[PDB]
Amino acid sequence: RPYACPVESCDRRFSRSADLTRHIRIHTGQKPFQCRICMRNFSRSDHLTTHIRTHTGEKPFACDICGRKFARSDERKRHTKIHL
DNA sequence: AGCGTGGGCGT
DNA sequence: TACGCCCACGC
Ligand SMILES: [Zn+2]
Ligand SMILES: [Zn+2]
Ligand SMILES: [Zn+2]
């Protein structure tokens, strides 16, 4: 990790410089992606993609056991474990 | 449950 | 750079 955050209060370090460039948005407060629906801003395009599903009700991820649908794969993952 | 949001990293 | 997921933490 040759790339450290130059911010005074922060001690984080990164392997790839591009990851620090993304991280630095936490301190500058830049949120480049906007929701056309509710006008809310987001720091990441991937998080913007999933936020919009809270409006459309789109749920691409169904549980392998019962078939209950989820907007994000991680919610389905958190759910599947309840069948154990 | 509903879902924000950072870290690791692949395309 | 710009984007897209997995994985995880958090409220
Ligand atoms: Zn920092
Ligand atoms: Zn929105
Ligand atoms: Zn299920």
A82: Cβ under 7 Å from strand B? no
* Whole-number Cα distances in Å, A58 to A37, A61, A80: 15, 9, 19
Q: Are residues A25 and A1 located together in one domain of the fold?
A: yes
What is the number of structural domains in chain A?
Answer: 3
Contacts of A14 (CB under 8 A, 6+ apart): A1, A3, A4, A5, A20, A23
Structure determined by = X-ray
Distance from the CA of A58 to the center of ligand 2, in angstroms? 13
Q: Are residues A51 and A64 in the same domain?
A: no
CB of A51 nearer than 7 A to strand B: yes
Range of the domain at A10: 1-30
Residues 17-36 of A with CB under 7 A from strand C: 18, 21-22
Whole-number Å distance between alpha carbons of A19 and A13 = 9
Measuring CA to CA, which residue among A35, A25, A29 is closest to residue A5? Answer: A25
Torsion of CA A43, A44, A50, A56, to 10 degrees: 70
- For residues A66 and A45, membership in a common domain is answered with no
DSSP state of A81: G
CATH number for position A22? 3.30.160.60
Q: Are strands A61-62 and A33-34 parallel, antiparallel or unpaired?
A: unpaired
